[PDB]
A paper describes a structure:
In humans, the CALHM family encompasses six paralogs, some of which function as non-selective channels that are permeable to large substances such as ATP. We identified the three paralogs, CALHM2, 4 and 6, to be highly expressed in this organ. The CALHM subunits thus constitute unique modular building blocks that assemble with different stoichiometries into large membrane channels. Despite the unknown activating stimuli, our study has provided insight into gating transitions of CALHM channels by showing two conformations with either a cylindrical pore of uniform large dimeter within the membrane that is constricted at the intracellular side as in case of CALHM4 and a conical pore that continuously narrows from its extracellular entry towards the cytoplasm as in case of CALHM6.
As in case of CALHM4, data of CALHM6 shows a heterogeneous distribution of decameric and undecameric channels, but in this case with a prevalence of the former amounting to 60% of the classified particles. We have thus chosen the decameric CALHM6 structure for a description of the conical pore of a CALHM channel. Unlike CALHM4, the lower resolution of the CALHM6 density of 4.4 Å, precludes a detailed interpretation of the structure for all parts of the protein. Unlike CALHM4, there is no dimerization of CALHM6 channels and the C-terminal region following the cytoplasmic helix CTH instead appears to engage in intramolecular interactions with the outside of the cytoplasmic rim for most of its length. Upon comparison of decameric channels of both paralogs, in CALHM6 we find a slight expansion of the protein parallel to the membrane and an accompanying moderate contraction in perpendicular direction. These differences are most pronounced for TM1, which in CALHM6 has detached from TM3 and moved by 60° towards the pore axis around a hinge located upstream of a conserved phenylalanine at the end of TM1.
Author numbering:
A (entry chain E), B (entry chain D), C (entry chain C), D (entry chain B), E (entry chain A), F (entry chain J), ...: 20 to 82, 94 to 282
């Protein structure tokens, strides 16, 4: 129960602290909103760029290269656009971005009060009492929500076009592509299991020879150059079907 | 419990943020309502256009074609019309679409206050106090609900006519069509299972030959051209009953 | 828990949105009530006309015919009358239908205020304050509930007469009719099961021959013309008892 | 959980809609109460007249007959009298029936206000403020409850006399009648089970002969005329004890 | 859950409708209270007169007779006196019976206000404000509770005397009477079971002979006159101990 | 759940109806309290006089006798004194018995107001406002509680003396008396079981001979005079230890 | 659930009725408090004097004797002192005993108001408003609590001294006394079990001989004089260790 | 559930009755606080002096002796100091002990009001309104809490020094002392079990010889003098290791 109580207390503290006031300030407010827009987005973008095992396979070993890189970058950049869309639909952040550069303000307000740019930043702060800006906050909320929805539409459209073209120009057919993906899944699980038990037997034998203090068995040697050889990425050629480069490396 | 608490917090944030104020604005309001009508509808339309495995079979491989395309498009377009109907029945969105182009306003209001078009947009905003428009918001709600119900009737009617004609002109009878669909279902499940275990044995053999470092078995080769050959779509001819083109491809 | 929470949220949104205000309008109100009466009724009528497997058997195959058609139409039209009865007993819809054509209003009001037809539509809206119409709304509620109950009586009476005559003029007796229906039920379940397993073996054999790449077995052929032949509908003749036309088709 | 939530919502809607206001109207009120008394009673009467399997046995086959018909009609009419008794004990319905024909009103009120018949119908409506009728509503409630209880007494008395005479004049004794009813119960269950499995074997054999496409077995024929012969109703004669006419039909 | 919800709704409706107002009326009130006293009592009396299997044994077969009849009538009349006692202890009913015939009123009130009989019936109605009757309602409540308790004492006394005399004059002793009752209980259960299985075998044999269409077995015949012979009631004679007349009928 | 809900409703009705107001009346109040004291006490006394199987053994068979009768009467009269003690400790009943005969009142009140006997009965009714009686109600509550506790002491004392003397003058010792009571308990249970199964076999044999219609077995006869002989009560004599007269009746 | 509901209702009634008001009365109050102190104490004292099986062994059989009698009386009188201590610590009872004889009052009050003895009894009643006695109630509460605690100390001290001396002068040592008590416990349980089964076999044999009606077995006779002989109490002599007089009676 | 409900009711009564008012009295207050300090402490001290089995071994048998006596007294006096410390930390008791002898008061108050000793006792009673004593109650609370904490420190210090010296001067080492304590624990449990079963066999044999009435077996005799011999206390000598004097008594 200790973990549960500490976690609820931590969550409450975290959220009460991330309370978003949108400080009404003449010049320090724009970055305040901008970081709450971009920085968590950049964070999730980086974590996506990290998590996928597809990129590490290419990166390791002392670092055509465009296609794979843009593919992985988009497959990871899926999510940060979702965060920025959800946030922009939250309305608070962009409403806080109202001030921005003075150009936004001068172009923004209808020019009714003739005193916009001076203390417009008070408009999400609710402290200004001029009727014009009290109506302008609403229009800013509108622009925020609309821009957010337009972005979440553009992202889904781009995902469609990307995956459709990637499914259109491949040489292999569909009903074979499904079987191929099932194959690679099974290969990964089998590799995990059997490599696990083989490392287990290696460790057992060597550690027993150490406890006794005698010569080892010398059963076999997994070649390191062979390991690097099977880490290749592309895994396709029209002639040598040979999926999963490991499987391709059984002819020699 | 962490997932549960985070999900409820996320849901509450999401819904409190998608709070729909319908900002009363002279010109920026129309698109505000229009995107909340169309964009989620377009989103669900695209996801439907994506999800069904029937279309990918046709699309892959470097892209009469009308019939299958309109069939799949309608079978996927079922749902977006449901979203737009539910939303239009919500009333808020179309009520927000009241303003639109000025033509809607000039034709819309009874001309009582003679000051409609100037600040009609305040009518869902509840800020205008002229009696005429305070009554006009109600009529707009009515037009919204009625249009929504008419649309949800037209969509069900169209679905009826579509599925009835598609069931009317087919050469095969009913009690055989049911058995045929059961057959294709069983074939899909059997294919999944046996292809899974065959890929499993392939991976096991090849990965063992790799761990040992010796020649593979060369059991058999699933031909890629054969795979593409069995991905065909139509699966009917009056003479060669041969359902499920895979099954049709057993004569040669 | 995600499904549960999303479903309760969706239900609350759906019902709060289907909130029925009965907009008080001089001319746009009548259709508002009329669609909420008829359209869901038409919807349930269509779904009934769709769901029953009895009609598809007749319809498929390029489309005395009166009797079966009216039987199926009534057996499906059972429910829409129930919806319209429940709704009319709800009172709100017909109360909203008060205005209708002006003929209803002129014949309706007792002529006390002499100003009925002008702004009677306000009477379910509760905005009119003339005593005469404030009493007239009550009488309209009465007419609604009474008409609803009369309809729900007429529908049960018609169902009685229909099923009684259909049970009266049949040649077969009762205690045999029960056994016959049990027989057809068992036949349907047996057909489902055995056709399932036979399609399973067909798919298994053909898919194995495909994986290997060799000739199939050629066990037997379910004739398509035979399938259509056994899809017949009537299933009765005084001489050849032969229930369930499939069973009738065992003599030749 | 979906069914549970939808059912509670439906029940709440149904009951809130069947809210009984007893509209105070000069002439349209009497039928309003009368239908809520009679129509659900007629409904339950019809469902009783339908549900019992005893009547269908007599009715089917192209339609002394008095005794069985009055027996079944009373055995089914048990319940509608219970509904009308419960409703009359509810008090609202008969209180609404106060107005009725003017004869009821003129005979009803004590003649104190001398203005009864004009706007007596307001008396359950609570809108009239004359002391005489405000006391008269109470007496009407009394007459309702008393009449209801008298009816629920008369119905139980009639049930007593009916079942007692039916138990008095039968030739067979009691301790044998109990065993006879147990016998018929067991016979019904055995018939259900064995007819079920026999229809199952019939369907299995015929459907296998169809799948193969060969001649059937011709095991035996349940004669339809025999089926009608065993559907007889009376099942008694002093000489040939032979309960359950099916059992009577074993001599020839 | 449907049954549970419908039952609680029905119970609430039933009890809210059986709400007992005791309408204050000059002449229609007395029967109002009297029926709520007697009619449910008569109902439970009749159900008791029905339920016991002891009376049917005597009644069937075309209808000393005093003793058995008064015994069964008292054994069933136990409960209605309990209902009337509980109700009279409820106080509301007899308080409503205050008015009754005018003789009760004239003898009842102390004659203080000299205006009792005119509008005494208002006294449980709480509408009369004369101090004398406002005190008289209390005395009436007292008379009700006291009479109820005296009745519930008289009924228990009568039950004592009845069962004691019935236990006093019997020829058999106690420790044998207990064993005799255990015997009859076991005999009833054995008869139920074995008659059940024998009717089961009868039905099975006859229904099989019907399905096949051949002659029955003719195993044995339970004689109907024998059945009536064993339905006798008295079951005692000093010489032929022979409990349970069925058992008495084993000598011939 | 039906039983649970009906029972709670019945209990609430029962207790709300047994609400004890102690009607303040000049002459009808004394019996009101007196019956609520004595009648339930008499009821529980009678049920005790009934329940014990010890008395029936003596009573049956056409009805020194003092000792057994007073023993059983006291062993059953234990409880009614407990009821009257609990009630008297309740205080309400005796407080209601304040008035009683006028002698109690004249001796009771201190004579301060000189107007006691006229309307003293109002003193538990709280309607009288003279200070003297408002203090006198408290003293009456005191007399009630004290008398109750004195009675509950006298009853326990009497129980002590009774059981002690009954344990003092018996000839048998203690450690043998315990074993004797265990013996009689075991004998009762064994008799129940074996008599049950013997009656079961009797019924089985006779009912089988009836179903077949043949002569019975004539196994043995439990003599009725023997049954009465073993129903004797005293079960002691210094010479023939022979507990449990049944056991005493094994010598001849 | 019936027992649970009835028990909670009974408990609530019991405790609400044992509500302790301490009636302020000039002379009837002292016994009111005194009985609530002594009588339940006497009750628990008597139940203790009854429950212990040690005293009955001495008492039965037509009634040095000081030591055993005072031992058992103290071992049972443990609890009543606990009740009186808890009650005296309750404070209400002794506070009610304030008045007592007039000597307590005259010695009690400081003599400030000079009007103590007249209406001091009002002091726990809170009705007197003289400051002196309003302070005197507090001192009386103090005297009550202090006396209670002194008594609960004296009782524990006496228990200590009693059990210590009883453990000091016994001839046997400790580690043997523990084993002896374990022995007597085991002997009691063994006696219960084996006497139970022996009485069971006795009853079985005799009741079978009765059912058959033949001579008994005459296995053996437990001598009654022997039973009394083994009921002796003291169970000690320095020479013949022979615990548990039953065990002592194995030499002859 | 009865035990649970009675226990919660008893606990509530007990605690509501032990409510501590600290009666403000000039002279009767000091003992009031002093008994609530000392008497429960003395009680727990006595129960500790009783419970430990170590002291009884020394005490029994007609009563260097200093060391064991002070050891057991301290090991039992652990707890009463804890009670008095907790109570003194409660603050109420010592605050009530404020008055005490007049010397405490005269030395206590700062002499500001010059009227301390007269009615200082009102200071925990909150009835005195002089500012000086209203501040003095706080200082008294302080002195109470501080003294309590100093006492709970002194007791832990004394326990440390006691157990450390007792662990310092013993001849045996630690790792052997632990094993010795484990040994004595196992010996106690083994003795309990085997003595139990041996007493069981003794009782069984003797009670069987009694039931039969014949001579016993005379298996063996546990000598009473031997029992006392093995009850010795010290259990140590440097030469004869022989833990657990019972074990020491195996040489002769």
């Amino acid at each position: 129960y200790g973990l549960v109580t500490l976690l609820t207390a931590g969550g409450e503290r975290i959220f009460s602290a991330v309370a978003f006031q949108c400080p009404c300030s003449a010049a320090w407010n724009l970055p305040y909103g901008l970081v709450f827009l971009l920085v968590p987005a950049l964070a999730l973008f980086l974590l996506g760029y990290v998590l996928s095992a597809r990129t590490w396979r290419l990166l390791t070993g002392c670092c055509r290269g465009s296609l794979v890189c843009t593919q992985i970058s988009a497959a990871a950049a899926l999510a940060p656009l979702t965060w920025v869309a959800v946030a922009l639909l939250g309305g608070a952040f962009y409403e806080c971005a109202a001030t921005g550069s003075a150009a936004f303000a001068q172009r923004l307000c209808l020019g009714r009060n003739r005193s916009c740019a001076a203390e417009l930043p008070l408009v999400p702060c609710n402290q200004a009492k001029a009727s014009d800006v009290q109506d302008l906050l609403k229009d800013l909320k509108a622009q925020s929500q609309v821009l957010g929805w337009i972005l979440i539409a553009v992202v889904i459209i781009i995902l469609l076009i990307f995956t459709s073209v990637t499914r259109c120009l491949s040489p292999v057919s569909f009903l074979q592509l499904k079987f191929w993906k099932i194959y690679l899944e099974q290969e990964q699980q089998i590799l995990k299991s059997k490599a696990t038990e083989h490392a287990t037997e290696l460790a057992k034998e060597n550690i027993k020879c150490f406890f006794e203090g005698s010569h080892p068995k010398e059963y076999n040697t997994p070649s390191m150059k062979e390991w690097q050889q099977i880490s290749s990425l592309y895994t396709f050629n029209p002639k040598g079907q040979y999926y999963s480069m490991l499987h391709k490396y059984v002819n020699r």
